[PDB]
Amino acid sequence: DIQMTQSPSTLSASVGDRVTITCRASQSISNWLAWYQQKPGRAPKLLMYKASSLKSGVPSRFSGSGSGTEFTLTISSLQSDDFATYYCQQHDSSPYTFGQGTKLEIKRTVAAPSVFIFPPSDEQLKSGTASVVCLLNNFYPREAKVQWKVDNALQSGNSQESVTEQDSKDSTYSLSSTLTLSKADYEKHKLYACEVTHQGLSSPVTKSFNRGE
Amino acid sequence: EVQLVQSGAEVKKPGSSVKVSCKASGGTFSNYAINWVRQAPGQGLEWMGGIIPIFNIAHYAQRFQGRVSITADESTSTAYMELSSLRSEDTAVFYCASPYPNDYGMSWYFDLWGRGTLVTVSPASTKGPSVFPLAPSSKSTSGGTAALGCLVKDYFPEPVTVSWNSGALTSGVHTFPAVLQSSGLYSLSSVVTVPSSSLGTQTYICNVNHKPSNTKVDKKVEPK
Ligand SMILES: OC[C@H]1O[C@@](CO)(O[C@H]2O[C@H](CO)[C@@H](O)[C@H](O)[C@H]2O)[C@@H](O)[C@@H]1O
Ligand SMILES: OC[C@H]1O[C@@](CO)(O[C@H]2O[C@H](CO)[C@@H](O)[C@H](O)[C@H]2O)[C@@H](O)[C@@H]1O
Ligand SMILES: OC[C@H]1O[C@@](CO)(O[C@H]2O[C@H](CO)[C@@H](O)[C@H](O)[C@H]2O)[C@@H](O)[C@@H]1O
Ligand SMILES: OC[C@H]1O[C@@](CO)(O[C@H]2O[C@H](CO)[C@@H](O)[C@H](O)[C@H]2O)[C@@H](O)[C@@H]1O
């Protein structure tokens, strides 16, 4: 099949900026490349086809270039409506393949996350399960690492995290990580902690509590 | 009047099959190339296959061959995508898309897109959530700011709404995207940061509504 490679995976910019996204094909596809824009929870929208043919209705600031194996999508003067994820797709032959997308976000200064840890409530313990929650609030960039530790021992496989979309007011992100343990395991250890690693922190920040205070 | 109309969202048990429809009653049906593009939560777009109506010429992606059948019905100007032997990994939004219908070449990029059909694969059935407090405390008080919240656990299916103090508190509130747990039940948390000086004088309540199960819960969150 034809493998499509998009870069960068994430692009940070500001209104007014001129930005460029690239897409490479593992083999020549002539001018048979299309570009789509997609916003959270919405269906993709066609912007460009045949490499440089602008879809009727799409703003002039969007322009495409390329042929063969190298293509680019350019936005001459980024507007707020342009922050979204973009995908390229070769329409040369089946199977039709897509690049893995480029998320165009709003750039702001690096902000360390404010970290908070929440022990499971006594009420939930009656259900036989315990949920320990770690909140990373209002940070930037989005990349962050949360590590759970029980009695100084690293956890693995028993946690899931969720992240909000970039805040429309402060351009930050927030993330919640939840460690799930049986009531038995929970009442077997004392120290519960979530260690957070982020660009804005010179060293990992650890928030914790001892079961039963 | 040229649009792709998709069937509504669905909830499916593992092992079952689902058949999503996409109606394109505008223009000539044979000039469409009804393709199906899947998008799993947090993943990119994935082509599944497509078909040219009337001519009934189909093309399939290797990964779905054997499990998917794409068809078209001229009488109703509707195309279908049937995915069988559903698994948890199959959970995703399925889009139908097609080049704009020419009127009498046909390139396979997608002018038109259906709004998408979400198919959720879970062994679970409808169920209201349990709401537990995420209480403020020492390790929950960064300087003069405190964080508190509600853990809306084990409900099905989506969606669930959350408000604070019946909508009187919206500032600093973050309600995270739900996560499908290993159990096939959803879970999500809603947090809010407030002045730590207000914990002894202000009441904090999260209002959770789960229409699917007609469940309503108001949980007052207080420091432990
Ligand atoms: O169908 C596999 C094929 O699809 C591509 C995109 O054209 O990747 C898609 O499918 C993967 C499997 O579900 C997802 O991980 C990915 O996000 C999605 O774009 C090709 O890379 C792959 O060969
Ligand atoms: O189009 C029929 C032709 O397609 C193949 C795969 O190349 O099977 C596909 O079509 C069937 C009929 O809709 C589906 O049952 C099957 O899952 C799908 O891959 C060939 O086997 C068949 O001759
Ligand atoms: O994709 C539907 C389309 O495929 C054809 C062959 O090109 O028939 C295949 O699909 C049917 C639907 O599942 C099967 O009954 C048949 O055995 C299989 O070859 C067309 O006839 C049909 O319109
Ligand atoms: O879009 C290029 C790609 O489309 C195919 C059909 O899948 O041919 C169509 O597009 C061409 C370019 O616009 C036309 O010349 C042709 O008539 C039309 O069917 C592929 O052959 C080609 O790689």
Side-chain angles (χ1 to χ4, degrees):
Chain A
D1 312 332
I2 298 169
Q3 185 191 193
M4 305 309 292
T5 307
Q6 262 180 277
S7 59
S9 180
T10 295
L11 201 163
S12 305
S14 313
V15 172
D17 286 350
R18 174 190 176 71
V19 306
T20 305
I21 297 172
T22 65
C23 173
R24 296 189 171 69
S26 58
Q27 77 193 224
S28 181
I29 60 176
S30 306
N31 315 154
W32 311 150
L33 186 77
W35 288 93
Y36 303 88
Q37 180 193 74
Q38 178 178 46
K39 290 182 183 177
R42 307 178 213 174
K45 175 179 69 174
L46 175 64
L47 304 168
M48 194 90 50
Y49 60 91
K50 289 179 179 182
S52 54
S53 292
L54 190 61
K55 170 63 179 174
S56 291
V58 181
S60 317
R61 53 175 191 290
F62 281 91
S63 62
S65 165
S67 65
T69 58
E70 300 284 332
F71 307 78
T72 68
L73 177 71
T74 303
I75 302 183
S76 62
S77 183
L78 208 57
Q79 295 193 183
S80 62
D81 186 65
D82 305 323
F83 295 101
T85 294
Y86 296 77
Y87 296 95
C88 59
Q89 179 226 314
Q90 61 84 9
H91 62 269
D92 166 81
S93 56
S94 60
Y96 294 103
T97 48
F98 298 81
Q100 291 313 118
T102 297
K103 181 180 182 59
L104 182 50
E105 61 155 8
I106 305 176
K107 189 179 179 57
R108 59 147 288 148
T109 64
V110 173
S114 292
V115 189
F116 310 86
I117 191 172
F118 300 105
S121 61
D122 295 294
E123 176 173 4
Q124 173 182 35
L125 289 192
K126 288 182 181 176
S127 72
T129 53
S131 296
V132 190
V133 179
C134 182
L135 168 69
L136 281 60
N137 208 48
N138 305 340
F139 58 95
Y140 184 93
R142 187 183 180 305
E143 287 73 19
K145 174 186 177 192
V146 176
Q147 208 75 5
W148 284 101
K149 298 179 189 171
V150 185
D151 278 335
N152 319 309
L154 290 180
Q155 295 300 297
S156 179
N158 47 8
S159 62
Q160 289 185 289
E161 51 185 53
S162 176
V163 190
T164 60
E165 295 293 345
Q166 190 168 39
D167 188 275
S168 64
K169 182 281 295 300
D170 60 31
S171 287
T172 61
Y173 295 95
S174 284
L175 175 161
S176 73
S177 175
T178 310
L179 176 68
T180 303
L181 305 167
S182 67
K183 177 177 176 296
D185 295 294
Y186 182 67
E187 286 171 349
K188 166 183 293 301
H189 305 290
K190 176 173 65 182
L191 301 73
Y192 284 86
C194 58
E195 191 182 13
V196 176
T197 301
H198 185 264
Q199 174 162 19
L201 299 171
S202 58
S203 57
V205 173
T206 283
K207 286 300 171 75
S208 60
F209 69 83
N210 300 307
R211 180 167 59 66
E213 293 186 300
Chain B
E1 278 177 45
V2 58
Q3 315 263 298
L4 299 182
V5 190
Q6 308 199 212
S7 46
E10 312 217 13
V11 297
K12 294 289 181 178
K13 296 288 202 304
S16 61
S17 73
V18 63
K19 185 170 181 173
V20 180
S21 57
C22 177
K23 182 164 188 177
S25 63
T28 57
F29 198 42
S30 57
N31 290 335
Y32 285 80
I34 307 306
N35 287 262
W36 293 88
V37 180
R38 161 185 192 274
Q39 183 172 55
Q43 294 305 299
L45 299 170
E46 179 174 14
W47 182 72
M48 301 185 73
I51 181 174
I52 302 172
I54 302 186
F55 287 96
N56 282 153
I57 300 178
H59 283 284
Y60 294 90
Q62 180 63 59
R63 193 165 92 68
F64 305 94
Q65 276 170 33
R67 281 219 301 136
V68 181
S69 179
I70 293 168
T71 53
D73 181 2
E74 180 192 66
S75 77
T76 57
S77 293
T78 306
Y80 308 77
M81 186 286 279
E82 175 160 59
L83 179 57
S84 46
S85 177
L86 288 169
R87 291 178 292 292
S88 293
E89 316 92 58
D90 286 312
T91 292
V93 170
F94 296 92
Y95 299 99
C96 56
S98 170
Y100 197 74
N102 254 306
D103 185 293
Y104 307 125
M106 176 188 264
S107 298
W108 292 57
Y109 52 81
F110 316 117
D111 276 283
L112 302 167
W113 288 78
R115 59 190 294 172
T117 290
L118 174 73
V119 178
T120 306
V121 175
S122 175
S125 303
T126 299
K127 177 179 181 301
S130 285
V131 188
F132 307 117
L134 290 176
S137 58
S138 295
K139 215 68 172 188
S140 180
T141 53
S142 175
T145 299
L148 56 89
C150 279
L151 169 59
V152 181
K153 199 182 199 306
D154 299 331
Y155 65 85
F156 192 84
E158 283 278 61
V160 66
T161 49
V162 183
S163 60
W164 286 87
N165 296 336
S166 310
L169 178 58
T170 50
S171 171
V173 170
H174 285 302
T175 295
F176 297 83
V179 300
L180 190 65
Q181 312 173 96
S182 175
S183 64
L185 296 172
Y186 297 107
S187 183
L188 79 63
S189 288
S190 184
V191 299
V192 54
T193 45
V194 304
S196 49
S197 70
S198 73
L199 302 178
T201 58
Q202 184 60 59
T203 295
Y204 295 111
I205 301 175
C206 68
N207 320 96
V208 180
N209 296 302
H210 185 229
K211 301 179 181 183
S213 69
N214 270 67
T215 293
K216 181 189 303 298
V217 179
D218 295 304
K219 197 71 179 186
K220 182 176 178 179
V221 182
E222 310 171 302
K224 192 171 183 177

